[PDB]
Design a binder for this molecule. Structure first.
Ligand SMILES: Nc1ncnc2c1ncn2[C@@H]1O[C@H](COP(=O)(O)OP(=O)(O)OP(O)(O)=S)[C@@H](O)[C@H]1O
Ligand SMILES: Nc1ncnc2c1ncn2[C@@H]1O[C@H](COP(=O)(O)OP(=O)(O)OP(O)(O)=S)[C@@H](O)[C@H]1O
Ligand SMILES: Nc1ncnc2c1ncn2[C@@H]1O[C@H](COP(=O)(O)OP(=O)(O)O)[C@@H](O)[C@H]1O
Ligand SMILES: [Mg+2]
Ligand SMILES: [Mg+2]
Lengths: 396, 320, 340, 258, 127, 254
DNA sequence: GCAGACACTACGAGTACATA
DNA sequence: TTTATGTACTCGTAGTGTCTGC
């Protein structure tokens, strides 16, 4: 029964050359999965130039809608392996994971007996999707998955979104590091030309670049967007492209580097920039990453060449003005995180810690955004403290 | 105990997609989906009271006129929307074998999905990816920022916008024609001004005014509902001549029983959303209002703190 | 022990000849142990407040009060966060310090005083570094010390007692301990060098130690030991004054701020400040020493000095009302360089 | 001499009454008079009422000079009741203007008398008498059968629809995972009269009830072997469990229908 | 498909359930061994190592309590713990379970019903 | 060089069930005359000591005293494996880093052999303080268990007071109060169920509810529990075994 | 009848967010 | 290694009570 399925499932990559974009990632994954046998007989000690021999498991990460799941499934199905997909809909705590696929790591399939030439039809490939969905942390399954990566007799594949979580730390180098990127506009353009031919809706070759850049390369939402537009108006041109863009902007939550990069721009604080990028927009930008934004502003509020200087005001005076408000917002943060827990002061902390200090030092930058160094020095200071009370206990 | 008449909010709740008035393109798209049948996953977002969940309910009713009671699941924050219940119930509903018409699919409506936990949304992602040729989800949240990125990736984002005064006026005249009531155009304009795009607020104010007086006049409307505090606070902040702001405060916020915390928070919101003045003066004003907010929250809530906040604002305005 | 500061320590009020009036007052308190109010010794750091407290304890309870036993205790806090603090217990009294994490010391001080309060007749409690208590902990300590008086007594040791809340200062008998004079430091150092073996020829070096210590007996003794082992137990009349590395780097930062006023100098100052904060020095003392080193530069004019001290006071208040301890120092340095 | 002196034979009795409504009600009060120890309390959700009456027949020796009000926390009272054996004899002892009662656990088999005191409480709930006397359907069925029916129908759904017809009793429990329909007809078991089911139908009844409160009702099925349901429209259901001297009657509010 | 297995073991379901629940309290894996007409249920884990040895015989008093085994080829098979617990959860249907072992084929745990069967196909682990 | 073959594993099963929760790590200092062990809880307030003589064992042979540091959860699992009619055979080697628990049945249908390693647990200080106890009472363990459970429901501090041959377990809390008194009942037809007291000097001792509830788990060992109290010495709750006994030492907590 | 085998409510501990 | 109460969620845990069958 056709013509009722989603356009994102009926027009799905069946074979490996239909996965538009990220050809290198797909071919690297296929090369890794095709040479795991000899690596297993090599006791994961000897590896080639790519290093696929010593990597017992490979994990996939990247933005949504680019084909991690589809490419993994096609590679698993093509080479005769039997798929074993997991998910966050199935609970994966310590108990249910130790009594889950722990037995299946060193055990072979039963369905491969009656489905059979195939030399890998009696094996498993563990496709663990939604591993970022497991927010258990300690005793939440991440340590169990680290143990599985350490000791598994079958290929293990993980799919997540991005790696900068402190939860995602224990997979620093124990797992292979293949990464997918935003697909190029040409492959998506050819795919959408085929889609337009199949679904008899008009698609101009030039509006597609704007459709892609609004959606930030998320192909699935692109197909859904063309479907829902062509439901009532199957022809798109320069006339409706602005309305479509403003109605279907992706609106991604910004990366901690990106909040600082956007906030330190001098264009947004100009008279034209204030109208287009209002103050409420800056408050929302702070609240995107309200934990790391107040610091990330502070480590590099003085490494920017100013462009919003008042006549007669030097750069050092602007830096001092920004530092005064950083110090003022420190008190508000302390009062928020105190015994009283007055959490209605967060919009105050926005202005006092990110908006105003960046409103005096905006402009083009001397260098690339520097990560919050206060965390590492705080850790070193804490270790130095612990050493000092230790030697104080010992000296008495 | 006396009986109660059904409130006009749901006594005149729309049942057809042509009844709701608002974003014309959005309603035309909903009607096109209604006629076609192949409903995609949608995330309806917008301000409160502008007709989000009523459009979803009307669309579901039109799509499943005969099997609404069987193939439409309605969940909200009032239900136990957690990982166990979401898993069990949504997976039982998405696999249930119900022979819908060829163009009709099961619809799982999730009202106010913004307050829904992250793990439940992660499970929903997998459920949507498996069962999409039999069931189609439909969210309705005030803000779409709470919903995770993959859910927006696999859905069709459809945002609503605040209604213009013309549409609110049209609906108000439609209801006034439906039920007999004497009205004055000044009263209707006052109700629309008080509503500020919120149709439900307009209906509540109209019903309250009719019950209290029986004539929809400007004086009756202003007696039932007071002037909104953001407007009087904005008038207080924008006005120069410090004595005028002081007396505006002491007359329209202190003697009218508005708490100091409410006044300070409203001032913060107004000066955040203010657009007449430049950026630097707004930043300074936010700084001073925040200092006063800190003083108020610490416990020192008096008239003199608000007067001092206004004095600092005016000293800023006159550029020392 | 190899250090001369600790094992050259008086053990009784008779051995204490530093201050005749303070010793007479302590003897007056110790004449009748039956009616002894709660004490609170305040004054500059390093003058020997704990020495006076221990001498008074021996004068009241008797001997054996120096037989300290290191007993370890366990505590339960929010979530799984477990804190282990060892109490330096002793017969006839007990010592406690806020060495635990600053935000959660209320429960520890609470259950220690509740446990000791159960079981001459009373058992004294000494709280070292009492100015570091959070204000809620002192509020809890208030009623705890007020309710139980026949069983517990508190000798509360603190320097710069301003952070102590008003009720605690109300129910505590306040005793002032002035800093050592130059003559007293010189006499103590002369006693130490006579008891030990150092080839000393001129009294000028001892007075130079007294001047460099700024009325700090412990720092003076540490300086004496350091350059005594450095000079092979033979002090020279032209011996250079050795200073702690923290003092040296603070002075270097002061000269850097004075000589140049640039944003690159500001980021270098940020790096230096982060290093010093990681070196475990409280931010209050860092700000005080930086301010007092800036004011000692002869190049600065009087208006710049006044602006510097005003900003120093403002940022000291902010440090007392802050929790990051680096943002305030960076702001202070930025304001100082803007002024200069 | 204590003014209140109530003696229990087979002290497991009072434990059974307490466990009958321990779960549904958290706060009760006992208006002890010369006729007997009555009680009446309403839940926190104001849906289910628990009336109670224990006559002088259930007590070995009962003497209550003046009306006494004993507002109580049922959790602590049930804990106190659990602090004993069914062999022991329980006694309620209260003085003038009571602050607490005295509970004695005595037995002549072995002298191990245990005296417990439970602190009283000021509920200050005057409530009102029952003002419902006319009911359409009056049916009595064995407690075990009704408890079993409620138990296996509460798993399907949260609403249990009890329908009454001409010599036909129907329970409908349509839910998400399926539906249910238990149809039981009146019959007189001569061999076991206690297992018979009786019906007295005047006007048709169609009422739905909450599953959790109906489970709380059937939790008292250990108190008596037979329960008499007395349904009526625009009237709460009356589930009465007979005692040796009084009764434990519940009042449950039917859910709204729209 | 119907294939000949190297060995066919038939023992009472209660006895088998007892033995496997005994061994599952020691390790997550069981190394079933059938050699020299001697069933060699063993299990080795971190806490320790367990072993059970049974002898096929015939019980005249109650034939359903006997152990019957036929020897065609030796076996070397390994199984998990929770899988075997889930298999024996259905041991109430049949007094005796018919287990067939093959070196390169799944085990067939079969419970004979009155007019049917409930046969489990459990794949042995890697060797 | 150890061969302790029980006649019924249920004895060892109920012993370990007796001391599951009071202590987790125990050093088995087995000797020729039997097995003795001493253990202290984490709170350093409860002391449990067990002693089983050779008279209980059907066979026993321990030439060299060996201190065995052994886990109790593993023993609980291995002895939950065991059941009736099976004779547990504790077997150790000359240097037994791993222990052997042979389960021998009457019939040859199924004989099981198990293993368990020996961890490193330091030898506990064997304090042999046996100060005289002022008062001594012995009541059936079921009665004491019921009394302590019912009084620990009310509060977290049970007072035990002995005077005039009337033991008064009083526990006062927030929901109310609880007072039970025991007369020195003597029984002829059933001598096992009786209350006898030796009140040399009155004592008034208060104990925590957690430890008093924990020490109940050894009720399966003996039908009678003997309690002897001293005003300053720790209380001694003793459980009679066929050969030896198991005792609990808890210091008073005023 | 007693001991298990189950499903059940209940308690404890840990992560996560906290203004639009 | 940070915030520091209160709330909500989620989990595995230990008792608690009820039904089967030796
Ligand atoms: N390279 C591609 N070319 C064309 N369509 C694609 C491509 N990758 C993905 N799609 C579309 O996206 C659908 C599913 O993509 P997925 O790989 O499942 O998304 P995803 O990468 O898993 O992101 P998540 O799981 O939602 S975070 C397919 O059925 C296609 O419709
Ligand atoms: N476009 C519209 N046409 C007619 N009535 C409308 C329209 N929008 C809202 N209403 C009225 O508003 C009420 C329904 O409001 P809702 O849709 O429930 O509010 P909402 O969109 O769900 O916002 P929230 O987030 O739930 S407060 C009814 O009284 C409707 O008659
Ligand atoms: N009367 C005295 N004579 C000699 N040394 C003294 C005297 N009083 C104090 N001191 C010195 O003070 C030092 C102890 O100071 P301390 O009690 O640590 O100061 P604080 O209490 O401020 O930390 C000892 O090394 C001791 O030599
Ligand atoms: Mg995926
Ligand atoms: Mg809604």
């Amino acid at each position: 029964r056709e013509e009722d399925k989603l356009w994102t499932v009926k027009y799905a990559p069946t074979n490996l050359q239909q996965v538009c974009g990220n050809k290198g990632s797909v071919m690297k994954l296929k090369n890794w999965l095709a040479n795991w046998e000899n690596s297993k007989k090599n006791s994961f000690k000897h590896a080639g130039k790519d290093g696929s021999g010593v990597f017992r498991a490979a994990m996939l990460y990247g933005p949504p809608g680019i084909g991690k799941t589809t490419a993994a499934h096609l590679v698993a199905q093509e080479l005769g392996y039997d798929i074993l997909e997991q998910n966050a809909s199935d609970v994966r705590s310590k108990t249910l994971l130790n009594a889950g696929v722990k037995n299946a790591l060193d055990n072979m399939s039963v369905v491969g007996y009656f489905k059979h030439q195939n030399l890998n039809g009696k094996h498993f490939v563990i496709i663990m999707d939604e591993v970022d969905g497991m927010s258990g942390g300690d005793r939440g399954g991440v340590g169990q998955l680290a143990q599985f990566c350490r000791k598994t007799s079958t290929p293990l594949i993980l799919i997540c979104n991005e790696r900068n979580l402190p939860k995602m730390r224990p997979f620093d180098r124990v797992c292979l590091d293949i990464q997918f990127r935003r697909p190029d506009a040409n492959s998506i353009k050819s795919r959408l030309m085929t889609i337009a031919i199949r679904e008899k809706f008009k698609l101009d070759p030039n509006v597609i670049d704007r459709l892609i850049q609004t959606t930030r390369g998320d192909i699935r939402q692109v197909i859904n967007l063309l479907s829902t537009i062509s439901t009532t108006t199957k022809t798109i041109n320069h006339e409706n492209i602005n309305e479509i863009s403003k109605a279907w902007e992706k609106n991604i939550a910004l990366k901690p580097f990106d909040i600082a990069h956007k906030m330190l721009d001098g264009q947004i604080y100009s008279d034209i920039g204030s109208r287009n990028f209002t103050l409420n927009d800056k408050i929302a930008l702070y609240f995107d990453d309200f934990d790391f934004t107040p610091l990330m502003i502070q480590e590099n509020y003085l490494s920017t060449r100013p462009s919003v200087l008042k006549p007669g005001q030097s750069h050092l005076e602007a830096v001092a003005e920004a530092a005064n408000c950083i110090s003022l917002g420190d008190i508000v943060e302390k009062k928020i995180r105190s015994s009283e827990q007055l959490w209605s002061l967060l919009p105050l902390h926005a202005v006092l810690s990110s908006v105003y200090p960046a409103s005096k030092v905006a402009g083009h930058m001397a260098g690339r955004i520097n990560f919050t160094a206060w965390l590492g020095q705080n850790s070193k200071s804490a270790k130095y403290y612990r050493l000092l009370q230790e030697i104080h206990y010992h000296t008495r | 105990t006396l009986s109660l008449q059904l409130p006009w909010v749901e006594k005149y709740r729309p049942q057809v997609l042509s009844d709701i008035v608002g974003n014309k393109e959005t309603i035309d798209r909903l009607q096109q989906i209604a006629k076609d049948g192949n409903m995609p996953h949608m995330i309806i977002s917008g301000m409160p009271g502008i007709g989000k969940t009523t459009s979803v309910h009307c669309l579901a009713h039109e799509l499943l006129g005969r099997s609404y009671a069987d193939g439409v699941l309605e969940l909200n924050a009032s239900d136990d929307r957690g990982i166990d219940v979401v898993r069990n119930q949504i997976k039982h509903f998405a696999q249930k074998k119900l022979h819908l018409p060829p163009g009709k699919h099961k619809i799982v409506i999730l009202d106010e999905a913004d307050s829904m936990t992250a793990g439940a949304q992660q499970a929903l992602r997998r459920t949507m990816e498996l069962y999409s040729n039999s069931t189609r989800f439909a969210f309705a949240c005030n803000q779409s920022n709470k919903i995770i990125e993959p859910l927006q990736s696999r859905c069709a984002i459809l945002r609503y916008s605040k209604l213009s005064d013309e549409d609110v006026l049209k609906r108000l005249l439609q209801i006034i024609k439906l039920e007999d009531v004497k009205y004055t155009n000044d009263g209707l304009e006052a109700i629309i001004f008080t509503a500020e795009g919120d149709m439900r607020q307009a209906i509540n104010n109209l019903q309250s005014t009719v019950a209290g007086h029986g004539l929809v006049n400007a004086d009756n409307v202003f007696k039932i509902v007071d002037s909104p505090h953001p407007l009087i606070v904005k008038k207080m902040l924008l006005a120069s001549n410090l004595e005028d702001s002081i007396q505006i405060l002491r007359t329209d916020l202190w003697k009218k029983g508005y708490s100091s915390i409410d006044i300070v928070t409203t001032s913060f919101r107004v000066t955040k959303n203010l657009a007449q003045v430049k950026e630097s003066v707004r930043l300074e004003m936010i700084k001073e209002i925040g200092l006063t907010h800190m003083r108020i929250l610490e416990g020192v809530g008096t008239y003199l703190q608000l007067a001092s906040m206004l004095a600092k604002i005016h000293k800023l305005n006159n550029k020392a | 022990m190899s250090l001369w500061v600790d094992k050259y320590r008086p053990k009784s009020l008779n051995a204490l000849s530093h201050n005749e009036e303070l010793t007479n007052f302590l003897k007056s308190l110790s004449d009748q142990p039956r009616d002894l109010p709660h004490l609170l010794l305040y004054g500059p750091n390093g003058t020997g407040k704990k020495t006076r407290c221990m001498a008074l304890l021996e004068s009241i309870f008797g001997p054996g009060v120096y037989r300290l036993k290191i007993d370890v205790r366990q505590f339960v806090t929010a979530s799984n966060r477990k804190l282990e603090l060892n109490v330096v217990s002793s017969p006839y009294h007990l010592e406690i310090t806020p060495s635990d994490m600053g935000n959660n010391d209320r429960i520890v001080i609470q259950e220690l005083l509740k446990e000791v309060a159960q079981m001459h007749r009373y058992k004294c409690v000494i709280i070292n570094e009492a100015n570091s208590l959070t204000k809620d902990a002192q509020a809890a300590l208030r009623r705890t010390m007020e309710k139980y008086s026949k069983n517990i007594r508190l000798i509360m040791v603190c320097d710069s007692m301003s952070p102590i809340i008003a009720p605690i200062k109300s129910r505590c008998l306040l005793i002032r301990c002035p800093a050592p004079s130059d003559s007293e430091i010189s006499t103590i150092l002369s006693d130490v060098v006579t008891n030990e073996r150092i080839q000393l020829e001129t009294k000028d070096i001892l007075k130079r130690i007294a001047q460099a210590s700024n009325g700090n007996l412990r720092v003076s003794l540490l300086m004496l030991e350091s350059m005594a082992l450095n000079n092979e137990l033979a002090l020279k009349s032209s011996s250079p004054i050795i200073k702690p590395d923290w003092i040296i780097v603070i002075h270097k930062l002061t000269r850097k701020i004075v000589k140049e006023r640039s944003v690159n100098s500001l980021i270098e100052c940020r790096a230096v400040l982060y290093d010093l904060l990681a070196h475990c020095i409280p931010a209050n003392i860092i700000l005080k020493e930086l301010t007092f080193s800036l004011l000692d530069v002869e190049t600065l004019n009087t208006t710049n000095k006044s602006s510097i001290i005003e900003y120093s006071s403002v940022f000291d208040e902010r440090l007392s009302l802050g929790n990051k301890a680096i943002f305030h120092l960076e702001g202070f340095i930025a304001k100082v360089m803007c002024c200069l | 001499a204590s003014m209140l002196e109530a003696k229990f034979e087979e002290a497991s009795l009072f434990k059974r009454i307490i466990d009958g409504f321990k779960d549904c009600v958290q706060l009760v009060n006992f208006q002890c008079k010369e006729d007997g120890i009555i009680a009446q309390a309403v839940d926190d959700s104001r849906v289910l009422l628990v009336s109670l009456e224990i006559g002088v027949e259930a007590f070995q020796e009962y003497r209550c000079d003046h009306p006494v009000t004993l507002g109580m926390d049922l959790t602590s009272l049930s804990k106190i009741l659990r602090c004993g054996n069914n062999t022991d004899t329980l006694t309620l002892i209260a003085d003038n203007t009571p602050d607490s009662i005295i509970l004695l656990f005595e037995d002549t088999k072995k002298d191990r008398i245990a005296e417990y005191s439970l602190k009283l409480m000021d509920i200050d709930a005057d409530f009102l008498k029952i003002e419902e006397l006319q009911y359409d359907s009056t049916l009595s069925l064995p407690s075990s059968e009704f408890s079993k029916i409620v138990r296996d129908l509460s798993q399907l759904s949260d609403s249990i629809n009890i329908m009454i017809t001409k010599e036909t009793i129907k329970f409908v429990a349509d839910g998400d995972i399926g539906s249910g329909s238990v149809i039981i007809k009146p019959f007189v078991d001569m061999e076991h009269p206690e297992t018979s089911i009786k019906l007295e139908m005047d006007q048709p009844v169609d009422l739905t009830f909450g599953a959790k409160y109906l489970l709380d009702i059937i939790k008292g099925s250990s108190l008596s072997d037979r329960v008499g349901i007395r349904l009526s429209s625009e009237a709460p259901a009356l589930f009465q469990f007979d005692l040796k001297s009084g009764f434990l009657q519940f009042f449950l509010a039917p859910k709204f229908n729209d």
